[PDB]
Structure formats: structure tokens, C-alpha cells
Amino acid sequence: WTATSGSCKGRCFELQEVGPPDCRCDNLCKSYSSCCHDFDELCLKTARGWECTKDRCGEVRNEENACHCSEDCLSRGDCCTNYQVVCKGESHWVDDDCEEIKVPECPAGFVRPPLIIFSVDGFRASYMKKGSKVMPNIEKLRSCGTHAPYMRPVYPTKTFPNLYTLATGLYPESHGIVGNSMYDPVFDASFHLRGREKFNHRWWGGQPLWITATKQGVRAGTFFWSVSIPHERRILTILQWLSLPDNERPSVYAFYSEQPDFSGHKYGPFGPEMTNPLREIDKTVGQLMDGLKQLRLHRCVNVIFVGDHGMEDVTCDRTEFLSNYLTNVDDITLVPGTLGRIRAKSINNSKYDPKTIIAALTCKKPDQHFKPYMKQHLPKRLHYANNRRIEDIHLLVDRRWHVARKPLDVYKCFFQGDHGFDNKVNSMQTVFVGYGPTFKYRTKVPPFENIELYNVMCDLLGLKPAPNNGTHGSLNHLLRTNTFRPTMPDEVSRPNYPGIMYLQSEFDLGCTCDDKVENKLEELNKRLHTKGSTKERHLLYGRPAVLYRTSYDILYHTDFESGYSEIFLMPLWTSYTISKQAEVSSIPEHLTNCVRPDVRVSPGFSQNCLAYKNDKQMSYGFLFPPYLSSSPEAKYDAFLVTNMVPMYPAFKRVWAYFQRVLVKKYASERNGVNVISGPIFDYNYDGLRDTEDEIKQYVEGSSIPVPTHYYSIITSCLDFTQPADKCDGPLSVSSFILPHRPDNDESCNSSEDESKWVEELMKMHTARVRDIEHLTGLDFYRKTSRSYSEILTLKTYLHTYESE
Ligand SMILES: *[C@@H]1O[C@H](CO)[C@@H](O[C@@H]2O[C@H](CO)[C@@H](O[C@@H]3O[C@H](CO[C@H]4O[C@H](CO)[C@@H](O)[C@H](O[C@H]5O[C@H](CO)[C@@H](O)[C@H](O)[C@@H]5O[C@H]5O[C@H](CO)[C@@H](O)[C@H](O)[C@@H]5O)[C@@H]4O)[C@@H](O)[C@H](O[C@H]4O[C@H](CO)[C@@H](O)[C@H](O)[C@@H]4O[C@H]4O[C@H](CO)[C@@H](O)[C@H](O)[C@@H]4O)[C@@H]3O)[C@H](O)[C@H]2NC(C)=O)[C@H](O)[C@H]1NC(C)=O
Ligand SMILES: Cc1nnn(Cc2cc(C(F)(F)F)ccc2CCC(=O)N2CCC(CC[S@@](=O)c3ncc(S(N)(=O)=O)s3)CC2)n1
Numbered sequence: 016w017t018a019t020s021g022s023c024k025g026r027c028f029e030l031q032e033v034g035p036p037d038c039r040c041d042n043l044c045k046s047y048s049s050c051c052h053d054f055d056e057l058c059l060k061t062a063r064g065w066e067c068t069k070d071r072c073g074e075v076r077n078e079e080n081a082c083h084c085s086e087d088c089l090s091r092g093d094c095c096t097n098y099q100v101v102c103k104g105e106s107h108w109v110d111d112d113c114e115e116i117k118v119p120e121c122p123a124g125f126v127r128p129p130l131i132i133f134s135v136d137g138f139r140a141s142y143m144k145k146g147s148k149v150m151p152n153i154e155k156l157r158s159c160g161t162h163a164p165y166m167r168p169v170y171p172t173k174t175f176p177n178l179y180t181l182a183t184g185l186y187p188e189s190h191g192i193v194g195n196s197m198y199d200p201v202f203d204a205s206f207h208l209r210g211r212e213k214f215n216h217r218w219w220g221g222q223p224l225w226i227t228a229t230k231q232g233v234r235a236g237t238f239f240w241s242v243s244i245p246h247e248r249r250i251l252t253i254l255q256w257l258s259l260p261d262n263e264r265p266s267v268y269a270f271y272s273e274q275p276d277f278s279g280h281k282y283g284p285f286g287p288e289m290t291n292p293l294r295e296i297d298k299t300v301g302q303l304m305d306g307l308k309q310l311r312l313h314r315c316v317n318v319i320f321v322g323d324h325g326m327e328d329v330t331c332d333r334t335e336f337l338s339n340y341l342t343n344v345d346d347i348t349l350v351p352g353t354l355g356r357i358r359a360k361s362i363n364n365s366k367y368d369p370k371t372i373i374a375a376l377t378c379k380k381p382d383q384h385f386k387p388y389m390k391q392h393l394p395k396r397l398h399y400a401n402n403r404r405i406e407d408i409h410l411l412v413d414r415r416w417h418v419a420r421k422p423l424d425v426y427k428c429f430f431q432g433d434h435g436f437d438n439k440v441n442s443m444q445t446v447f448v449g450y451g452p453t454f455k456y457r458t459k460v461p462p463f464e465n466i467e468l469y470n471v472m473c474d475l476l477g478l479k480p481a482p483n484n485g486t487h488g489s490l491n492h493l494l495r496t497n498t499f500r501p502t503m504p505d506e507v508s509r510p511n512y513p514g515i516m517y518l519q520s521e522f523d524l525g526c527t528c529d530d531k532v533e534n535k536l537e538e539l540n541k542r543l544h545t546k547g548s549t550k551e552r553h554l555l556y557g558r559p560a561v562l563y564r565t566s567y568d569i570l571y572h573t574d575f576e577s578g579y580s581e582i583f584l585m586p587l588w589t590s591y592t593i594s595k596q597a598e599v600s601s602i603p604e605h606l607t608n609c610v611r612p613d614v615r616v617s618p619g620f621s622q623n624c625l626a627y628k629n630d631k632q633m634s635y636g637f638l639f640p641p642y643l644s645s646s647p648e649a650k651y652d653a654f655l656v657t658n659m660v661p662m663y664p665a666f667k668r669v670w671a672y673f674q675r676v677l678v679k680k681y682a683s684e685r686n687g688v689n690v691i692s693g694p695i696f697d698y699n700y701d702g703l704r705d706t707e708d709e710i711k712q713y714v715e716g717s718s719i720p721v722p723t724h725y726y727s728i729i730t731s732c733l734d735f736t737q738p739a740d741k742c743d744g745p746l747s748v749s750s751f752i753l754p755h756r757p758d759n760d761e762s763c764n765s766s767e768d769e770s771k772w773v774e775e776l777m778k779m780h781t782a783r784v785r786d787i788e789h790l791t792g793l794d795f796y797r798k799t800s801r802s803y804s805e806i807l808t809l810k811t812y813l814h815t816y817e818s819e
């Protein structure tokens with residue numbers, strides 16, 4: 016209930032909201048059906064439009080006008096944004112040359128440069144180039160400020176998850192806004208775009224920037240705008256707030272445009288109808304910048320122009336129907352469209368089986384335009400699992416397609432655009448420009464992820480960020496000043512360096528190897544290798560630091576070095592360098608099933624071959640590949656029991672092709688590579704390293720835990736004219752986190768040779784180094800020549816494999 020008979024007089028776009036039944040005058044009151052009776056009359060004036068004209072200059076103030084051209088308007092803070100251009104001979108901001116903003120040039124009383132976030136819905140990254148002729152204000156912000164070629168959104172690439180990620184620095188799984196539509200089974204409640212459940216605070220986790228600011232004594236303008244407030248009025252409201260007294264004036268503001276998304280859905284991303292929305296957005300930027308210039312704020316404010324996601328060509332004829340695969344289609348609930356999420360229609364149906372739904376959806380049609388996953392099997396880079404609002408069964412839909420339950424859902428076309436697909440898809444990428452005293456001048460930065468921006472907005476305002484998924488410091492290169500200078504994390508566990516401590520006969524592991532094959536030149540030599548003489552070649556960036564409490568050993572070899580876990584009975588990491596000139600060899604026939612005890616590591620902290628023999632599902636692989644041994648004698652090291660890891664036969668196909676073919680391919684293409692590989696245990700799919708008590712599967716009969724995934728980090732010189740092991744400058748990296756699965760059901764062409772499917776699999780499971788850090792508790796690149804912030808940027812890089 017709302018007692019709508021209060022008044023909005025002197026309360027228009029008030030910044031503190033009032034409690035029901037008292038009526039509201041804030042920028043969300045329309046969205047709550049709570050505005051006072053006179054809110055339209057007083058707060059949404061439109062009389063005489065939005066621009067001063069020659070005949071209005073010096074007029075007598077008429078409070079009915081939408082904005083003013085009278086002499087007092089500047090000190091009142093309510094002039095039309097073009098007032099000084101029409102009435103005082105000034106130039107539009109867009110017509111002024113770019114001039115470096117070295118320091119904030121702010122009116123007295125400003126304690127910090129304000130931040131204005133200019134957010135645009137569905138603003139696809141390529142609009143910056145393809146629309147540049149019709150967006151002169153945006154183009155000047157871009158060329159004169161700091162810009163990225165694109166900014167990566169989060170998955171799903173929809174509005175609500177992405178705006179809230181922008182606001183919090185959190186993945187959707189952590190902030191809780193996992194879609195535009197959700198069912199929370201603990202609440203037993205549904206969140207939808209229409210309706211009122213979405214206003215309940217219980218959906219919205221983390222700490223968004225406006226709360227962060229308020230808690231630390233920095234005032235914030237309200238970020239949300241009811242859809243019927245026109246853009247001109249949003250801009251004028253911000254500019255009016257910027258004229259508040261010092262004690263009342265916010266330091267952080269957001270504008271939001273529903274365009275170009277709205278028109279994109281109707282017309283496709285490049286429909287000829289798209290030029291006009293782009294022009295109109297540009298005009299709105301121009302109104303802000305002119306208005307800031309009038310207030311002497313154009314060289315004071317930091318402005319961020321940022322999108323939530325892009326837009327793809329999608330029509331209703333490109334819909335896949337679950338009714339074509341499932342016999343039981345009425346026993347499921349589908350969240351449909353550019354992704355799918357499936358759960359049982361009724362929790363009383365004991366016949367509902369996810370395994371049989373997955374199987375009925377797996378590789379059933381030759382051109383099938385979606386792929387089912389149990390959520391824990393989705394690519395780890397999507398970080399899309401650890402939330403009860405994310406259904407166990409997921410469908411990753413191909414770009415340009417939809418999925419629906421039944422044909423009647425789609426005809427009971429309108430639309431030519433949509434979005435929501437995998438966040439590496441080129442059409443889903445969006446934009447970032449920063450312009451202001453605190454951003455760099457005329458500077459292009461590499462693409463980055465939108466989860467990073469919260470930290471930077473905090474830096475811009477002198478705020479300590481709440482705990483988030485950004486890597487704070489990774490975007491320091493965007494900033495002229497207010498950089499954040501973190502210290503590397505301290506190592507928690509120091510390694511042991513075991514020497515030869517065990518005789519061969521102390522091992523009863525059921526392993527065999529044909530290696531009784533016998534010199535002081537080459538005996539001193541092999542001793543030096545075991546003591547670390549080649550470690551500078553294979554460990555190029557220092558050993559990784561272990562950031563949690565555990566017991567592990569460093570093991571040196573000619574060809575590779577490893578950090579061996581006494582708790583998990585395998586390496587945490589294995590590091591090796593393969594030059595451009597390295598040669599690939601086969602496993603000799605006599606060594607095919609060779610596994611050799613490691614005389615540095617106790618039988619009690621070793622794996623055993625008998626467990627693998629007994630476990631009919633599980634085989635083994637090696638982390639340092641025998642194929643890349645530097646010599647026949649060095650090859651014996653590769654068969655140590657301490658280089659062995661549990662592998663499903665199905666996975667061995669993948670891993671063998673990576674090791675035998677791809678590593679050498681990358682070393683040829685990149686002029687040598689350094690490789691760090693290892694196991695990952697994430698049984699609770701939270702993106703973080705499991706403790707021992709979280710492990711759900713062991714090699715039958717043993718204490719050997721089975722990884723959920725295998726990683727590799729592949730580093731070389733960014734200047735590929737220099738070999739990876741003699742690189743003077745910046746590094747280049749690509750990484751993956753491969754799911755350790757007992758079948759290759761994910762890969763529909765897996766019956767073909769590995770050359771036709773393995774690399775496509777690996778591309779899908781591309782990863783950042785930081786993703787592997789979360790998953791292992793390890794900290795990489797500890798000893799380079801490079802600045803730490805540069806290394807943090809390196810750690811957030813994702814190799815996406817999309818074209819330009
Ligand atoms: C991305 O960045 C984020 C932010 O840094 C990372 O998320 C953090 O991860 C931590 C570990 O998973 C986690 O720490 C836990 O916090 C518990 C207190 O949590 C509440 O308070 C905080 C602080 O304000 C708040 O942020 C939390 O918000 C979550 O939950 C609400 C619902 O209340 C949601 O609205 C909100 O969206 C958010 O949800 C997300 O996180 C929760 C987990 O907290 C998930 O379940 C959701 O799916 C969603 O992803 C909470 O309101 C604290 O109680 C935990 O303590 C347990 O573990 C410790 C280990 O130190 C143990 O010693 C204790 O005994 C304790 O265990 C007891 O409870 C167990 C569970 O009931 C029980 O099994 C035991 O037997 C014990 O009784 C723990 O410290 C932190 O909350 C989140 N923060 C956020 C915002 O998500 C994230 O990891 C990053 N991602 C990556 C990939 O790096
Ligand atoms: C979510 C969310 N989380 N935090 N915020 C606040 C926020 C943060 C930022 C940030 F962080 F960048 F700084 C910027 C701007 C805002 C305000 C957005 C705003 O005023 N909105 C009201 C209108 C809504 C339209 C839905 S309908 O038009 C559609 N729904 C879904 C659609 S689609 N395109 O199909 O996915 S369109 C959007 C929100 N909003």
C-alpha cells in the first residue's frame with residue numbers, strides 16, 4: 016500500500032528513498048508504482064524540449080520548462096546541455112581538440128574526481144569501428160582516452176548477470192544473478208524480468224559499488240532508472256546532482272541505456288535500422304559532455320563507457336526442439352533460448368533421471384546446435400556451477416541458435432537478434448572506454464574481462480574493494496595514477512628436497528620395468544641432474560609457490576622438475592621446457608609398461624601398479640611425456656612412479672595427442688615452450704582447490720585420488736624471434752583445464768582420429784592461469800624479470816581461438 020497523496024515538490028529524484036506507505040520521488044518510484052501524484056508534473060517536465068534556441072537565450076525563468084536558457088541556469092545547475100553553445104558562443108565538446116588531462120581540473124570543494132559510468136545495453140564490440148562515422152562523441156572518448164578493442168562479458172551473456180557482475184566484480188555463481196530467469200529451490204521462489212520477486216534483496220549477493228562507496232563514506236547517485244524516464248532527463252538529473260553542495264553531492268553515478276539492445280533484438284546486430292539508435296546514443300554522450308563542460312567538469316570527471324554484452328543474428332527458424340529428442344518432454348522444465356537449463360517438472364516424479372535425459376540429448380543429429388552438460392562438466396572458464404539456482408543439466412547453444420521445449424513455445428519472425436551464448440563468442444563481446452584525469456591518454460589496452468572493472472572503479476574512488484573475482488592490479492596499465500600495488504602472496508609450505516633414501520627392494524608396488532642396464536663421466540653427470548643442474552632450463556619462472564599447508568617434495572630430473580605431493584601421491588605441478596629443435600621419439604617396445612620406483616620417495620608415499628591393474632576402469636599417464644625425452648637414458652626418468660597420474664583410457668587419447676603431437680607443434684610455432692602440467696581436484700565444482708576430505712573417487716583399492724581435471728600452462732616469448740628459454744621481454748601464454756572424463760561423449764566426432772577432434776576439445780577448455788591458481792592453490796611466475804602488475808595481466812589472459 017502507497018499513500019500517494021504526499022507531494023514531490025523539491026524532492027524530484029531525491030537520493031534517499033522513503034519507506035511505504037510514504038510516497039516516493041526517486042528514480043525507481045515508477046518501477047514500484049509508488050511515485051507521488053505530482054511526480055510526472057514536477058519531475059518529468061518536457062515543455063519546450065531539450066535544447067536552447069537563439070530566441071530562448073536570456074529568457075525569464077519559467078519553471079515549467081524541461082531545462083533552462085535563462086541567465087541564472089548555470090548557478091541553478093539546470094541549463095539545457097547546449098545552453099553555452101547556443102547562448103554564449105561556446106563549442107560543443109566534440110568539436111574541441113583532445114588535450115591530455117594530466118591532473119584533475121575540478122571546482123573548489125571537490126574532494127575527488129567524480130566517476131560517471133555510462134552503460135549501454137547490447138553494445139557489441141564491433142560497433143566502435145563499424146559505427147564510428149555516426150558516433151563522433153563516442154569516437155572522441157575512445158581515441159583520446161583509454162580503450163580496449165573489446166571487453167569480455169560473463170556467461171550467460173545476458174543483461175542481469177552482466178550488469179550485476181559489472182557492479183560487484185563477482186561471477187554470477189557468486190553474486191547469485193545466474194540468469195534473467197531463475198528458480199531458487201531453498202526459497203521456493205522464481206525470479207523473472209517482469210514482476211516483483213526481482214526487487215527482493217535476497218536474490219542479490221555480494222557488495223555492489225554503490226554499497227561499497229556508501230559504507231566507506233563516498234556518496235552515490237542511484238544507478239537504476241525506470242524505463243519511462245527519458246535519456247535526456249537521466250542526463251539532466253546527473254548534471255543537477257553534480258551541482259549539489261559539497262556535503263550532499265555524490266562522487267559516483269551511473270547512466271543506463273536500454274539501446275542499442277532493444278533495437279538489436281528487433282533488427283539484428285547490423286540491421287539498417289541500427290544506425291539511428293547508435294546516432295541517438297552518441298547524441299546522449301554529447302549532451303553529457305557538453306553539460307559537464309558548462310559546469311567546468313569535463314577535465315575533472317572520469318567517464319567509463321561500458322557495455323553489458325553484444326548481439327548475434329538469431330531467428331526463430333534456428334530453433335532446436337527438445338520434443339525432437341526426448342520422449343518424456345512434459346516431465347521437464349526448460350529455461351529456454353540462447354542457453355538451456357533443465358530440471359524435473361515435479362520433485363515427486365521418482366522416474367525423472369538426468370542420466371537418461373543427457374544421453375537422449377547427446378550427439379543425436381549430425382548438425383546438432385546445442386550440447387548437453389552436467390554443470391560440473393561445463394568449461395571451467397565459464398565459472399557456471401556453484402549456485403543452487405543453476406540447474407544440474409545445462410545446454411550450451413551454438414551461436415545463432417535457440418533451444419526450446421516444443422514448437423508451440425516459439426509460435427504461441429518477431430526477432431532477428433539475441434545474446435546469452437558462451438562468453439568467448441565474438442558477437443557477444445562488448446566495449447570499454449575510460450576517459451578522464453585518472454585514465455591514460457590515447458592508450459589502447461588488451462581485451463580484458465568485465466569482472467576486473469569493480470576493482471578499478473574502487474581505485475578511481477579511493478575505495479577498498481569488497482572480496483571479488485577480479486585480480487587487483489591486473490588493470491593497472493589502464494591508469495595514470497591510483498594504481499594498486501599488491502605484493503605477491505607468501506608461500507605457505509616450503510618443499511623438501513629428498514635425496515636417495517630407499518633401496519629398490521623396499522618397494523612392493525607390483526610394478527615392473529626392463530631397466531637393469533649399467534662410468535664416472537656420465538655417473539657424476541646424472542647425479543648433478545638429480546641435484547638440479549638443468550633446473551634453470553625447465554623451471555624458467557621459478558618454482559610455483561604453494562599457498563596452503565601441505566607436505567611435498569621437489570624432484571629434479573634432466574628433462575623436468577616436479578613438486579610432488581606426499582598427500583595426493585602425485586605431482587601438484589610438473590615443469591619442462593621444449594625448444595624449437597626438440598625431437599619427438601616413441602616409447603621403446605621394451606619400456607611400454609615400464610613403471611620404476613623413485614628411490615627418493617618412500618613406498619608409503621608412492622602410487623602402486625597393482626591398484627591400476629585391479630581397477631578395470633582406470634589406467635595411467637605421465638605428466639612429463641616420455642615422447643619428449645632428451646635422450647634414451649633420460650627417458651627412464653619419465654617412467655618413474657612419481658611422474659604417473661591416473662587416467663581413464665578415454666582421456667589418455669586426448670592427453671597422448673596433446674603430449675605427442677601438440678606440444679612439439681607449439682614449440683615449433685612459438686620458438687620453444689615452457690610447459691607446466693598437473694592434476695586438479697574440484698569435486699564440489701566451486702572453482703577452488705579441494706582438500707583431501709572432498710575427494711569422491713580413488714583408484715580402486717588405494718589411496719590414489721582421481722583428478723577431476725588436468726591442466727597445462729604453456730608459456731613462451733611474446734617476441735617469438737627469441738627462444739622461450741632466452742626471452743628478454745614480455746611473455747605469451749595459453750592454458751587449458753581439460754575435464755578428466757571416462758568417455759569422450761562431449762566430442763561427437765571422437766570415433767575419428769585425434770587430429771579431427773582433440774584440439775577442438777582443448778580450445779573449448781581454454782583457461783586463464785588465474786583459473787588454475789584458484790583450482791590448485793599454486794602461484795606461478797614468481798621469478799621473472801617483469802613487473803608484478805604485468806604478470807597479473809598475463810595471469811588473467813584467455814586465449815580464445817576466435818578470429819579478429
Ligand atoms: C569469487 O570471489 C568470491 C568472493 O571472494 C568467492 O566467494 C567466497 O568464497 C568463500 C569460500 O567458498 C566463501 O567463504 C565462506 O563464507 C561463509 C559466510 O558466507 C556468508 O557471508 C558472506 C560475507 O558477507 C557472504 O558474502 C556470503 O554470501 C553468499 O551466500 C549468500 C546466501 O547467504 C548469497 O546471497 C551470496 O550470493 C553468496 O553466495 C555464494 O557463496 C556461497 C558460499 O558462501 C555459495 O554456497 C553460493 O552458491 C554462492 O556461490 C554468505 O552470506 C562461511 O560461513 C564459510 O565457512 C565455512 O567454511 C570454513 C572454512 O574457513 C569452515 O572452517 C567453517 O567451519 C564453515 O563451514 C561450516 O558451514 C559449512 C556449510 O554450511 C558446513 O558444511 C560445515 O560443516 C560448517 O558448519 C566460508 O568462509 C565466501 O562466502 C564467498 N563469497 C561470496 C560473495 O560468494 C569465490 O570463491 C570466488 N571464486 C573463485 C572461482 O575464485
Ligand atoms: C541488473 C543490475 N545489476 N546492477 N544494476 C544496476 C546498474 C549497474 C551498472 C554498472 F554496474 F555497470 F555500473 C550500470 C547500470 C545499472 C542500472 C541498470 C538499470 O537502470 N536497470 C533498470 C532497467 C533494467 C532493464 C531490464 S529489461 O530492459 C531487459 N532485461 C533483460 C534484457 S536482455 N537484453 O534480453 O538480457 S532487456 C536493467 C537494469 N542493474
Ligand SMILES: [Ca+2]
Nearest residue numbers: 136137174323
Ligand atoms: Ca543487456
Ligand SMILES: [Ca+2]
Nearest residue numbers: 697703704705
Ligand atoms: Ca573445490
Ligand SMILES: [Cl-]
Nearest residue numbers: 193194195196
Ligand atoms: Cl536466463
Ligand SMILES: [K+]
Nearest residue numbers: 627630633634
Ligand atoms: K586398469
Ligand code: NA
Nearest residue numbers: 759760762765
Ligand atoms: Na564422442
Ligand SMILES: [Zn+2]
Nearest residue numbers: 137276280434
Ligand atoms: Zn537483450
